[PDB]
Amino acid sequence: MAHIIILKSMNATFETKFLVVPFKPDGLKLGRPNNSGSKRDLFSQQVRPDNGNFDSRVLSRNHACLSCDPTSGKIYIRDLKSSNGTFVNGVKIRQNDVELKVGDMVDLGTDIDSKFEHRKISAYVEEISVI
């Protein structure tokens, strides 16, 4: 089964994401983006609705991590020691899992500056479901 989370931007910073969240101990990274990894590095360095990349300089490359508990199907986020921080419903979190539920807000970063690509990421947890 594909456990999906839908992230809708509340501050005009990204196209709505439809993310398949892997079961722990795997996870989906949130952050800023002639080779055997070319086809994988290409799509992985893009900002796509199906990946965790955002076009915001405020974000760390490895900023936060989403994972799914295969026992309950619950979705968790944790910070990856980002420079500018991960927030859930406004609360600054750390490196331990925090559960996400529909109606929650995830903010990535803070920003000194609200201009194009300098604005923090504000993501609303619009839906969580299987398949």
Can you give a write-up of this model?
With 131 residues, this protein is mostly beta strands. The chain has one domain. The chain has one helix at 38-44; strands at residues 3-9, 17-20, 28-30, 64-68, 75-79, 86-88, 91-92, 98-100, 105-108, 121-130. A 6-stranded antiparallel beta sheet has the order 2-1-10-9-6-7, with no helix packed on it. The protein has a 4-stranded antiparallel beta sheet with strand order 3-4-5-8, with no helix packed on it. A hairpin with a 6-residue loop joins strand 4 (64-68) and strand 5 (75-79). The protein is globular and about 40 Å long. Component of a complex at least composed of FAR3, FAR7, FAR8, FAR10, FAR11 and VPS64.
Descriptive keywords:
protein binding, 6-stranded antiparallel beta sheet, globular, mainly beta, monomer, 131 residues, 5% helix
Give a brief description.
This is Vacuolar protein sorting-associated protein 64. The chain contains 1 helix and 10 strands. Helices cover 5% and strands 35% of the residues.
Structural class: mainly beta
Distance between the termini: 6 Å
Oligomer: monomer
Largest sheet: 6 strands, antiparallel
**What's the domain count?**
1
Q: What is the tally of beta strands?
A: 10
The helix-strand sequence is EEEHEEEEEEE
Strand order across the largest sheet:
2-1-10-9-6-7
Rg (CA only): 14 Å
Strand fraction band? 35-45%
Count of helical regions: 1
C-alpha geometry? globular
**Helix amount, in percent?**
under 10%
Subunit structure: Component of a complex at least composed of FAR3, FAR7, FAR8, FAR10, FAR11 and VPS64.
Domain FHA: 28-93
Function: Participates in the control of the reentry into the cell cycle following pheromone treatment. Involved in vacuolar protein sorting.
Subcellular location: Endoplasmic reticulum membrane
